[PDB]
C-alpha cells in the first residue's frame with residue numbers, strides 16, 4: 019500500500035523510533051487501510067512514497 | 068488501483084459498504100474533532116468616548132477664547 | 139504477602155494475593171475490601187455485600203467567598219481610572235480659563251466643586267454637557283460590565299453529576315492508569331461514560347496518575363481545575379482528613395460490592 | 400459655596416454612592432437573569448434539625464420498622480417524632496404519600512424505597528425529587544429454591560450482566576429513557 | 581444483588597415564585613445598609 | 629450566592645477616609661478665622 023505522509027491522514031506516530039513496519043504510522047488513511055483489508059481479506063505493509 | 072487489477076471490483080464495493088455503515092463518517096470525527104484540540108474588559112471601547120471629551124474641551128476653549136474678544 | 143487483592147495472570151494462569159491465598163490452600167477465609175467480580179466467583183465463594191459502593195468524583199472543596207478589594211479595580215481597568223482623572227483635571231482647567239494670585243485659587247476651588255460631579259456662557263456650557271455625556275457612558279459601562287461578572291458568577295454551577303463532567307472541559311479529569319476504575323470507561327458503552335473515555339483516552343497531558351495518591355494532590359493543587367475519579371469508599375474517607383480540602387459529589391457510576399470470601 | 404472643606408465630602412460621598420447604587424444595579428440584573436433555585440432538604444440529618452417541614456413514612460412496612468428498630472444517632476430522632484406526630488404522618492399507601500407532598504407545597508417530606516423514588520421523579524408532572532444519599536444499604540436479588548440446579552447458574556450469570564453493563568443499561572431504559580421528565 | 585438501594589427522601593421542587601419584601605434586602609447586604617447609614621450619619625456629622 | 633460585601637467594602641474606606649480628610653481640612657478652615 020503506497021501512501022503519502024500527510025496530516026491527519028498518514029502521520030508518524032510519536033514513539034515511531036521504537037516501532038517497526040505498520041505500527042510506525044497512524045491517521046485517517048491508516049485506519050482506513052486495515053478496514054479495506056478486512057472486507058477483502060489480505061495482509062499488507064504500508065510504504066511511504 | 069492499477070488498471071484492471073484483481074482488487075478492482077471488491078475494493079470499490081467494500082468502500083461503499085463503509086459509507087452507509089457510517090464508519091467513514093465516524094473515522095473523520097475521530098481524527099478531525101475527537102482527537103483535535105478545539106470575564107474581563109478593555110480600554111479600546113472606552114477610548115472612543117475620551118477623544119470627543121477632549122474635543123469638547125478644545126472646542127469650548129475656542130468658544131472661551133472668542134467670548135473674551137467680543138466683550 | 140504480595141499486597142494485591144485478586145487477579146488472574148492470563149499467561150501463567152496463576153491467581154495472586156488474598157483471592158489466591160484462598161485457592162491454593164493457605165487461608166480459610168478473606169475479610170477485606172474484596173470486590174465481588176465474576177472472574178473470582180467462579181473460583182472462590184463470596185458472601186453478600188457488606189458495603190455497597192461504586193465509582194465517584196473527588197473534586198476540590200469549593201473554597202469560600204471571596205477575594206478582596208481587588209475586585210473593585212477590575213471591572214473598570216486601572217488604565218481607565220487614570221484617564222478619567224487626567225480629563226477630570228483637564229476639564230476643571232478649561233473651566234478655570236473661563237472665569238490676583240489668590241483669585242485663581244478660590245475659582246479653582248470652585249471649578250473643582252463643579253468638577254466633583256452630580257450661567258449661560260456658551261463656552262463653559264458645552265464643556266459641562268460633554269462631560270456629563272462622558273461620565274454617562276463610563277458609569278453605564280461600569281454597571282454593564284460589573285453585571286457580567288456577577289451574572290456569570292451566578293451561572294458557575296457546582297459540578298454535581300458525572301454528566302456535568304462530560305458537558306464541559308474547563309475542569310480536566312482522569313482516573314488511575316491501571317485498575318478496575320479506568321477499565322470501566324474504556325469498556326463502558328453508556329452514552330455519558332462513552333464520551334468521558336474518548337476525551338480521557340486522547341487527553342494531553344496525562345489525565346492518568348501512577349498512584350492513587352497522585353490524584354488527591356492533583357485536585358488539591360489545581361484549585362478546582364482538576365477532578366479525580368475512584369471508588370466511593372476511598373473517596374468519602376479522604377474528605378474526613380486534613381486539610382479538609384476535597385469532597386465527594388453526585389451519585390456513583392456503578393454498583394459494586396465488597397464481600398467476605 | 401465653594402467651601403473646599405466639605406467640598407470633597409460632597410465629592411467623595413458622591414463617588415461612594417455612585418459605586419454602591421451601580422453595584423446594586425449590576426448584581427440585581429444577575430438576579431433577574433439566572434433566577435437559580437435551592438432545595439432546603441439535603442440529608443436526613445437535615446430533617447431532624449428542623450420542625451417546620453413535617454415528614455413521614457408508610458404505616459406498615461420495612462421502611463416503618465427500620466426507624467422503629469434503628470439505633471443510629473440521627474435516625475433515632477426521626478422515629479421519636481413520627482410515633483407521636485399529630486396528625487398521623489403515616490400515610491396509607493405510596494400514592495397517598497406522593498400526593499401528600501404534591502399537596503403540601505413543600506412542607507411534607509416522604510421516605511420510601513429509592514427505586515420508586517427515582518421513578519416518581521420521572522413520572523408526570525415532574526414535581527418531586529429524591530434528595531441526599533440513601534439511608535441504608537439493601538439489595539434486590541434473584542430467588543431460587545434451596546438446593547436448586549439453577550442456583551449457581553443464575554448467580555454467576557448475574558455478575559456477567561452487571562460487568563458487561565447490561566443492568567446499568569436496563570435501568571436507564573425503564574427509568575430515565577422512557578421516563579417523562 | 582442486581583440493584584443496590586436504600587431508603588430515600590422525597591421532596592417537592594420549589595417554583596420560581598417567592599413573593600415578599602425580602603428579595604430587595606438580599607442584593608445590597610444587611611451589613612452594608614448599616615454602614616451606608618453609619619457612614620451616612622458619618623457624613624452629616626462631618627459637614628455639621 | 630448573593631452580592632459580595634468585599635468589593636463594596638473598598639469604596640467604604642475611600643469614603644470614611646475622605647470624610648476624615650475633610651474633617652481635617654475643615655479643622656484648618658476654622659483656625660485661620
Ligand SMILES: O=c1[nH]c2cc(C(F)(F)F)c(N3CCOCC3)cc2n(CP(=O)(O)O)c1=O
Nearest residue numbers: 143144171172173317318319350368369371372
Ligand atoms: O478486589 C479489589 N478491591 C479493591 C478495594 C479498594 C479499596 F477501595 F481501597 F477498598 C481498592 N482501591 C485501593 C486504592 O485505589 C483505589 C481503590 C482497589 C481494589 N482492587 C483493585 P482494582 O478493582 O482492580 O482497581 C480490587 O481488585
Ligand SMILES: O=c1[nH]c2cc(C(F)(F)F)c(N3CCOCC3)cc2n(CP(=O)(O)O)c1=O
Nearest residue numbers: 459460461462463492493511512513514515516
Ligand atoms: O421483598 C420486597 N420487595 C419490595 C419491593 C418494592 C419495590 F420497590 F416496588 F420494588 C416495594 N415498594 C413498593 C411500593 O412502595 C415502595 C417500595 C416494597 C417491597 N417489599 C415490602 P417491605 O420491604 O417490607 O417494605 C418487599 O418485602
